[PDB]
Amino acid sequence: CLTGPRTCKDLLDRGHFLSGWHTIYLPDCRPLTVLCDMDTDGGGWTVFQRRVDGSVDFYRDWATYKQGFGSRLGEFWLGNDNIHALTAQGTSELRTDLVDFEDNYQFAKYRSFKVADEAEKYNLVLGAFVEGSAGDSLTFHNNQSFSTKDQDNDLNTGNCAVMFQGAWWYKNCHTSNLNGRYLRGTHGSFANGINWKSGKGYNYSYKVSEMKVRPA
Amino acid sequence: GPRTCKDLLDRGHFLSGWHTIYLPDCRPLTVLCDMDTDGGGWTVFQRRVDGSVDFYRDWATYKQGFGSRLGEFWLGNDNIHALELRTDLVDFEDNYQFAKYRSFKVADEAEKYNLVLGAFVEGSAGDSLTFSTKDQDNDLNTGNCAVMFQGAWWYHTSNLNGRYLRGTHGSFANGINWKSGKGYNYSYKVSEMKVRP
Amino acid sequence: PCLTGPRTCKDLLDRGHFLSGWHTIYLPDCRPLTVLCDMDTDGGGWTVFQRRVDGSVDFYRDWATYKQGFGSRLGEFWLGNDNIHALTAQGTSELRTDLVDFEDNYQFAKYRSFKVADEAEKYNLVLGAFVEGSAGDSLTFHNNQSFSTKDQDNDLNTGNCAVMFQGAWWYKNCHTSNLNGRYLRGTHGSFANGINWKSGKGYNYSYKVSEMKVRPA
Ligand SMILES: *[C@@H]1O[C@H](CO[C@@H]2O[C@@H](C)[C@@H](O)[C@@H](O)[C@@H]2O)[C@@H](O[C@@H]2O[C@H](CO)[C@@H](O[C@@H]3O[C@H](CO[C@H]4O[C@H](CO)[C@@H](O)[C@H](O)[C@@H]4O)[C@@H](O)[C@H](O)[C@@H]3O)[C@H](O)[C@H]2NC(C)=O)[C@H](O)[C@H]1NC(C)=O
Ligand SMILES: [Ca+2]
Ligand SMILES: [Ca+2]
């Protein structure tokens, strides 16, 4: 542990050049098998969310988002407890990678990203937007509690997670909804897909979504 | 150490994927755990997904197991013996169906891996299950079956080790078929057979 | 660890690992390397160093990237020229190339020995006799050539083969195989810039699956 890899970036520095699932040791020494992206933007990113085919249901409850769900073989959410543990020491960059159904790639990159602990409802703490073809659709959500269908912490009199079939740091309501429904390209329905407002908008659900972190 | 995928789930392993468990005799085995289906903690012993793996194999091959962690496999008759049953099915339009049985077991090679099933509990895919290889004649129905329907099974109304024919096919009952599901002329996109304490 | 660990995928097969998948082996210098073992094909025990299956990975990469390796354990990859040299530098490894088209037809080629030289020798291909194979022999043509990438032209053409055929290979003047070419999905009108094996499906058909793999012989 004290001499073991603590991030995907550590692994890259130690000559692990292929993306895939590797064990790392969290700050408290807990081992955790995580997906490393060793290619994108210099490589060494720890991936905490992945959408690619709609095989996994993301419309899930608080407990499920807390612990994590999905499959190493495809789509997953790494889990709110784990994402907190990964980001708690304050200085990881965030990258969001998005691909549409014509294989057009867009991204957003943020200077810092953290979620707080469960007691603080996994509050989003987001640093400055640095750049990205996808534009900034996350700053809007800064300093907001995470919400799921069964724990509404949003700023709407109704339930955002239900209204947009997802789980997110909803306010009233969103400009991004990456845990929304896998609706496959253009959809008439308003904003309930894998949507990034400044990217492809409220009526286009991406083919691929990945959210990932790396020591700044 | 963990003895089942249910044990791994209990220990905080929440994502499906390959994990090592310890069989009743302490022999380590890396198995696929389904942590997301129906409560989770299932050990998957058969999987079809892309037709990348040849399932028309002989006795020794089904005995020891074959395929790939990257996709399709048969965990192996020796392993499956050492280890409720659920069958999960998906068509090329991404429609999900399933079955479920109260008990499931296979005997050793002396018993020639005789199937010891149980009661059909439920399942949208319906009931089509209530061992023979191409080089081991054991069929129920006289003559041959494995060679006839190009698979390996307890020879049928189901044929999950059949050919990956990809959806509707003209040939008869020789694909990944489940009578009560899509019939003898439709081969599933995805098939999985899994167990749990 | 290295004292008792497997040194090849063949060792793993012998120890009772019957499913293909990623396993750690120990290189001749004790360096551990997680490699993909093919335990299914032709007796099993093969170490896979190249895999194409879905076009998710860009193979049009520079010398540095080919040297260290790139791609994903989840699908497509090039294990890396330094690793391939390490794996084949000593003893005799045979080579098998497995190819699948989009109509489910499987072809292969098998070679008696296969070695890539070190970086100073530009990862020179040292290939033994063609043994057999439904894909025909489209690699002997490339024996005793340097590896070339878009940024490192070591080929025998007055132009840049890597750029012209959008890949990285032991290009001559220029090629009969191009398995690191673009994932063009079957028939393509562009000339010889896909995952092509001339004696197999020709210069205008890019395979669905390509695997290159080695085993002690
Ligand atoms: C592999 O191919 C090389 C040439 O190809 C280059 O090197 C290889 C390793 C790859 O990296 C390729 O990409 C390169 O393009 C062959 O080398 C030639 O071999 C022939 C004999 O088969 C040599 O011809 C002889 O030359 C003798 C003089 O040798 C010295 O002087 C020459 C220049 O005249 C010089 O080139 C050579 O290296 C020596 O310094 C001569 O006495 C004799 O009569 C005969 O003609 C030829 O010179 C070599 N060329 C080169 C460029 O070295 C390898 O033999 C071949 N190996 C195998 C296993 O087939
Ligand atoms: Ca509300
Ligand atoms: Ca040239």
B139 is in an annotated binding site: yes
End-to-end alpha carbon distance in chain C: 25
**H or E segment at A50?**
strand A45-51
Q: Which residues of chain A does C79 touch, with a Cβ-Cβ cutoff of 8 Å?
A: 18
Q: How far apart are CA A147 and CA C2, in angstroms?
A: 49
Q: What is the largest CA-CA distance in chain B?
A: 50
Within B37-159, where are the H helices? Answer: 59-64, 77-82, 146-149
Residue of A nearest to C70 (CA): A18
Q: Which residues of chain B does A54 touch, with a Cβ-Cβ cutoff of 8 Å?
A: 94
What top-level class would CATH report for the domain A135-207?
few secondary structures
Q: How far apart are CA A26 and CA A92, in angstroms?
A: 14
Does residue C183 contact residue C58 with C-beta atoms inside 8 Å? no
Does residue A107 contact residue A100 with C-beta atoms inside 8 Å? no
3-class DSSP state of A41: helix
Does residue B118 contact residue B103 with C-beta atoms inside 8 Å? yes
Within chain C, all domains assigned CATH 4.10.530.10 are found at 136-208
- Closest CA of chain B from C175, distance in Å: 28
**H or E segment at A130?**
strand A129-131
B1 token code pair: 């150490």
* CA C195 / ligand 3 centre spacing (Å): 20
Mark yes or no for CB contact C72/A18 under 8 Å: yes
Tell me the CATH architecture of domain B1-125+190-197. Answer: Alpha-Beta Complex (3.90)
Q: C193 CB under 6 A from ligand 1?
A: no
A61 Cβ neighbours under 8 A, 6+ residues apart: A148, A149, A150, A151
| C70 interfaces chain A, CB cutoff of 8 Å | yes
What top-level class would CATH report for the domain A1-134+208-216?
alpha beta
* CA C130 / ligand 1 centre spacing (Å): 23
Amino acid found at C110: K
The percent helix, strand, coil of chain B (3-state, each to 5) is 10, 35, 55
- Closest CA of chain A from C116, distance in Å: 20
- Exposed, middle or buried: residue C15 (CB in 10 Å: 0-12, 13-18, 19+)? exposed
B159 Cβ neighbours under 8 A, 6+ residues apart: B149, B151, B153, B173, B174, B175, B176, B177, B178
A152 is in an annotated binding site: yes
B109 Cβ neighbours under 8 A, 6+ residues apart: B63, B77, B78, B81
Q: How far apart are CA B74 and CA A77, in angstroms?
A: 28
Mark yes or no for CB contact B68/C19 under 8 Å: yes
Q: C145 CB under 6 A from ligand 1?
A: yes
Which residue, by CA, sits nearest to atom 9 of ligand 1?
C144
- What φ, ψ does residue A93 adopt, rounded to 5°? -75, 155
Listed resolution, Å: 2.0
Experimental method: X-ray
The percent helix, strand, coil of chain A (3-state, each to 5) is 15, 35, 50
Within chain A, all domains assigned CATH 4.10.530.10 are found at 135-207
Strand partners, A23: A33
C88 token code pair: 């084949």
3-class DSSP state of A164: coil
> Where does C136-208 sit in CATH, by number?
4.10.530.10
3-class DSSP state of C87: helix
* CA A172 / ligand 2 centre spacing (Å): 8
Within chain C, all domains assigned CATH 3.90.215.10 are found at 1-135+209-217
Within chain C, where are the H helices? Answer: 9-14, 63-68, 81-88, 161-164
* CA A143 / ligand 2 centre spacing (Å): 16
Does residue B196 contact residue B42 with C-beta atoms inside 8 Å? yes
Ligand nearest the Cα atom of residue C161: 3
| A142 interfaces chain C, CB cutoff of 8 Å | no
Amino acid found at C160: N
Does residue B77 contact residue B62 with C-beta atoms inside 8 Å? yes
B125 token code pair: 């895919």
Burial per residue of A31-42, b for 16 or more beta-carbon CB atoms within 10 angstroms, e otherwise: ebebbbbbbbee
B170 Cβ neighbours under 8 A, 6+ residues apart: B185
**H or E segment at A62?**
helix A62-67
Within chain B, all domains assigned CATH 4.10.530.10 are found at 126-189
Fold for C1-135+209-217, please state it: Gamma Fibrinogen; Chain A, domain 1 (3.90.215)
Within chain A, all domains assigned CATH 3.90.215.10 are found at 1-134+208-216
Q: Which residues of chain C does A19 touch, with a Cβ-Cβ cutoff of 8 Å?
A: 71-74
Q: Which residues of chain C does A21 touch, with a Cβ-Cβ cutoff of 8 Å?
A: 73
Fold for B126-189, please state it: Gamma-fibrinogen Carboxyl Terminal Fragment; domain 2 (4.10.530)
The residue whose CB lies within 8 Å of the most ligand 1 atoms, and thus the one to mutate among C119, C144, C148, is C144
Q: C173 CB under 6 A from ligand 1?
A: no
- A79 dihedral zone (left: phi>0; alpha: psi -120 to 50; beta): left
Range list of β-strands (E), C65-139: 70-71, 77-78, 93-100, 106-111, 114-116, 125-127, 130-132
A178 token code pair: 């990456």
